[PDB]
Amino acid sequence: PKMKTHRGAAKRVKRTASGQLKRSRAFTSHLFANKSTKQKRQLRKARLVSKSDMKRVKQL
Template sequence: MPKMKTRRAAAKRFTETGSGQFKRNKAFKSHILEKKSPKRKRNFRKAALVSKSDYKRVAKLLPNG
């Protein structure tokens, strides 16, 4: 059986935490920033965790951790 390949696009976007969850960056922070409040833009910087409903899908894209 050959090795399973990792989806490189997913590998660049998600990192696995020690507890096995996946960390992700937030969307909507790259342009059209004038109308967004400073508080909202500041919160975009913080990482979030992949939701329970998407976990299985992301795990399938990253078979080797």
Template structure:
């Protein structure tokens, strides 16, 4: 069988951790940050983990 291809859009958005979980960036930080509180924008800088219900779907997009 040929190799599976990595979904390039997903590869730019998600990274695998050492234990195999998937990291992601928070949403809503791109623009219109002037009307959001400083605390809210600061907390959006921190990454998050993909929910367990979505892990399987994204792992198929990132086979390696």
């Protein structure tokens, strides 16, 4: 039958080709210096995308 998507990848947005992710350590932990908390920039998924790119395959 059709193939099903991993519904818990509500944490990835498809770029033109690849996928963008969210930063871990992002909350309820803030006894930190301030150069540290500030880098909440966007990083993409690595070349572990060969283990899990068939599961988010209609996110397109």
